[PDB]
Design a protein. Sequence first.
Length: 28
Amino acid sequence: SGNYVLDLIYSLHKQINRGLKKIVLGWA
C-alpha cells in the first residue's frame, strides 16, 4: 500500500513508449 501497484504498471508503460519510438520513429 502507499502509492503502490500504480508505479509498477507504469514501469512497463515507459518500455512500450520508448520501445515504439526509436524503431517506430526511426524508419519513416
